[PDB]
């Protein structure tokens, strides 16, 4: 069972990388006012979700 | 007064020709890179050769 | 002829200013898209597209 | 029950093939700068997920 | 309970028909090079999934 969770955590570890890189990749353009503040709220919150996971 | 009109108009037309040539050059480069991109798309076959054409 | 030629100048002024506003708009469009490539969100082809615009 | 998991694993064995071929077939184009690192991050991570599964 | 599974299997029996007809209907066009091998992979894997189910 511990091995099972040992892998299942490894999944979320990857998704957290995806959401985080996507977030910084949004903000770096967002200093030049990227695609509204809407997507920034669509990115920062997902990262909080992957963080909680 | 007529030839004054005409010669100025001619000069102007030449300038227009210049700018137009610029634009179409860039359009060429663009469409080319788009082409090569889709060709790479067919490199693993994501599309059809017609699309390439 | 007099009245016609008179109005034509007006119309030209009109199209002038409008094309100008269009210029700025498309310009910052290109700037946005450019920056978007800089963070790597999109293919270079789009960059060249906005270039052509 | 062991037979049940014996098949349920066989499913993930196929999905892993899908994600892997999708990833390699993205990268082979991506040396020509395919659709940014975006889809590459959308492919490299999903394969990690199927790997964890 | 056995009756419950007796119906729940009957569902997957139909979905397997759908995926299979979809796969053959892709391949028959795919000898003439249908919409990339991408959709052939998208059809071949789903059928494996319905098969495992």
Curated annotation (Swiss-Prot), chains A, D, E:
- In which compartments does the protein localize? Cell inner membrane
- Per the record, the coiled-coil ranges are 1-31
What top-level branch of life does the organism fall under?
Bacteria
Expression induction or repression: Expressed at very low levels under standard laboratory conditions.
* Assembly with partners or alone: Homohexamer. Part of the tripartite efflux system MacAB-TolC, which is composed of an inner membrane transporter, MacB, a periplasmic membrane fusion protein, MacA, and an outer membrane component, TolC. The complex forms a large protein conduit and can translocate molecules across both the inner and outer membranes. MacA interacts with MacB and TolC, and this interaction changes its conformation.
Per the record, the similarity remark reads: Belongs to the membrane fusion protein (MFP) (TC 8.A.1) family.
Q: How does the entry describe the domains?
A: The periplasmic domain is sufficient to bind MacB. The membrane proximal (MP) region plays a critical role in the stimulation of MacB ATPase activity.
Q: What does this protein do?
A: Part of the tripartite efflux system MacAB-TolC. MacA stimulates the ATPase activity of MacB by promoting the closed ATP-bound state of MacB, increases the capacity of MacB to bind macrolides such as erythromycin, and provides a physical link between MacB and TolC. When overexpressed, the system confers resistance against macrolides composed of 14- and 15-membered lactones but no or weak resistance against 16-membered ones. In addition, MacA binds tightly rough-core lipopolysaccharide (R-LPS), suggesting that the system could also transport R-LPS or a similar glycolipid.
Name of the protein in question: Macrolide export protein MacA
Question: Which species does this protein come from?
Answer: Escherichia coli (strain K12)
Full-sequence range covered: 107 to 159 of 371
UniProtKB/Swiss-Prot annotation, chain B:
Give the knockout phenotype.
Cannot grow on efflux substrates novobiocin or fusidic acid.
Superkingdom in the source lineage: Bacteria
**Annotated localization:** Cell outer membrane
Q: What is the effect of changing residue 42 to F?
A: Partial channel opening. Increases sensitivity to vancomycin, by allowing its passive diffusion across the outer membrane
**Family to which this protein belongs:** Belongs to the outer membrane factor (OMF) (TC 1.B.17) family.
Q: What does this protein do?
A: Outer membrane channel, which is required for the function of several efflux systems such as AcrAB-TolC, AcrEF-TolC, EmrAB-TolC and MacAB-TolC. These systems are involved in export of antibiotics and other toxic compounds from the cell. TolC is also involved in import of colicin E1 into the cells.
Record note on domains: Forms a continuous, solvent-accessible conduit: a 'channel-tunnel' over 140 Angstroms long that spans both the outer membrane and periplasmic space. The periplasmic or proximal end of the tunnel is sealed by sets of coiled helices.
What does the annotation say about its assembly with partners? Homotrimer. Part of tripartite efflux systems, which are composed of an inner membrane transporter, a periplasmic membrane fusion protein, and an outer membrane component, TolC. The complexes form a large protein conduit and can translocate molecules across both the inner and outer membranes. TolC interacts with the membrane fusion proteins AcrA, EmrA and MacA.
**Protein's UniProt name:** Outer membrane protein TolC
UniProtKB/Swiss-Prot annotation, chain C:
Consequence of gene loss (knockout): Cannot grow on efflux substrates novobiocin or fusidic acid.
Compartments, as annotated in UniProt: Cell outer membrane
This molecule's function is given as: Outer membrane channel, which is required for the function of several efflux systems such as AcrAB-TolC, AcrEF-TolC, EmrAB-TolC and MacAB-TolC. These systems are involved in export of antibiotics and other toxic compounds from the cell. TolC is also involved in import of colicin E1 into the cells.
User: Per the entry's comment, what about the domains?
Assistant: Forms a continuous, solvent-accessible conduit: a 'channel-tunnel' over 140 Angstroms long that spans both the outer membrane and periplasmic space. The periplasmic or proximal end of the tunnel is sealed by sets of coiled helices.
This protein's assembly is summarised as:
Homotrimer. Part of tripartite efflux systems, which are composed of an inner membrane transporter, a periplasmic membrane fusion protein, and an outer membrane component, TolC. The complexes form a large protein conduit and can translocate molecules across both the inner and outer membranes. TolC interacts with the membrane fusion proteins AcrA, EmrA and MacA.
Q: Which family does it belong to?
A: Belongs to the outer membrane factor (OMF) (TC 1.B.17) family.
Q: What is the protein named? A: Outer membrane protein TolC
Question: What's the name of its gene?
Answer: tolC
**Coverage span on the entire protein:** 130 to 182 of 493
């Amino acid at each position: 069972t511990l091995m099972e969770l040992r892998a299942q955590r490894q999944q979320a570890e990857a998704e957290l990388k995806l959401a985080r890189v996507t977030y910084s990749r949004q903000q770096r353009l967002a200093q030049t006012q990227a695609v509204s503040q809407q997507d920034l709220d669509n990115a920062a919150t997902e990262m909080a979700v992957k963080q909680a996971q | 007064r007529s030839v004054v009109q005409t010669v100025r108009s001619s000069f102007n037309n030449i300038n227009a020709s210049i700018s137009s040539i610029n634009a179409y050059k860039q359009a060429v480069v663009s469409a080319q890179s788009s082409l090569d991109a889709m060709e790479a798309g067919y490199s693993v076959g994501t599309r059809t050769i017609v699309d390439v054409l | 002829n007099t009245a016609t030629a008179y109005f034509n100048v007006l119309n030209a002024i009109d199209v002038l200013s409008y094309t100008q506003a269009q210029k700025e708009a498309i310009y910052r469009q290109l700037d946005q898209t450019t920056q978007r490539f800089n963070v790597g969100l999109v293919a270079i082809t789009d960059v060249q597209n906005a270039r052509a615009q």
